Amino acid sequence: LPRSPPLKVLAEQLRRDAEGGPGAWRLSRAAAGRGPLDLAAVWMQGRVVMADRGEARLRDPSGDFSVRGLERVPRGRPCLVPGKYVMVMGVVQACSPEPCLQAVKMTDLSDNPIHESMWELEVEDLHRNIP
């Protein structure tokens, strides 16, 4: 649904660097010597800490984030279980004090330990390569 791509981000980036509001979110890059990065959809990853109906709380190394609308997403290997490591493609609803996403997808990344160990590096590498 979203026009812009699902940017890889850590919770801290939304929590600390996001500006604007609904329909006009910006990631500040002033420190990195670059202009604002517009964002609507994101790719985030984390451990499921809590799940109740189509809502979940997830944890990446930088902090927690909430996900809603999970009853609507494609049904891969079930992963709405505390302890599972998962990816979410979501539309940003809120950034601070806790980032909140409306889910497009949530899928399991628990089988392969490399995903969790690579994620922080993936976010850094991607952000190094956006003008």
Binding site: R77, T107, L121, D125, N129
Partner: protein, 151 residues
């Protein structure tokens, strides 16, 4: 074409993977093959057996762009567990066709859960892209990435 912009060599070919946005910004003039870490956002067409092979179209993302892709027959055969000719032979035998239906569902789940390295041939003249191979991420990829970030 007998020349390349040397300043984009790492941008297109650095391990463990590269970015679709960077590929597109380079404005390729010839078919260019890159490796990206991507997931499927959505399927965009039916699974077809036209031509006696499997095909399907999907929109993938690597976090930097969307790209509509086709998947090679061999990938889909591996995921379903039946080639098209095998599926057609199975139909007259309920127990065999049931194995195929189970494979179809397995393929569906596999494509929902897909998050891996995709080797993609992008043809800028035809605005077409074909996924040639899939690879699970491994520790060599992690080390490649750390090296790139000098960590």
């Amino acid at each position: 074409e007998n020349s390349i912009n040397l300043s984009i060599a790492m941008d297109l070919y650095s391990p463990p993977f590269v970015y679709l946005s960077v590929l597109m910004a380079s404005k390729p003039k010839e078919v260019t093959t890159v490796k990206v870490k991507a997931f499927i956002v959505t399927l965009t067409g039916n699974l077809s057996s036209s031509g006696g092979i499997w095909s399907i179209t999907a929109k993938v993302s690597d976090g930097t762009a969307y790209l509509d892709v086709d998947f090679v027959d061999e990938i889909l055969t591996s995921l379903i567990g039946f080639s098209v000719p095998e599926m057609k032979q199975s139909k007259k035998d309920p127990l065999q066709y049931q194995k195929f239906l189970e494979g179809l569902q397995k393929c569906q789940r596999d494509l929902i859960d897909l998050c891996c390295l995709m080797t993609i041939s992008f043809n800028p003249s035809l605005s077409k892209a074909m996924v040639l191979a899939l690879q699970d991420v491994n520790m060599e990829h992690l080390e490649n990435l750390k090296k790139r970030l000098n960590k």
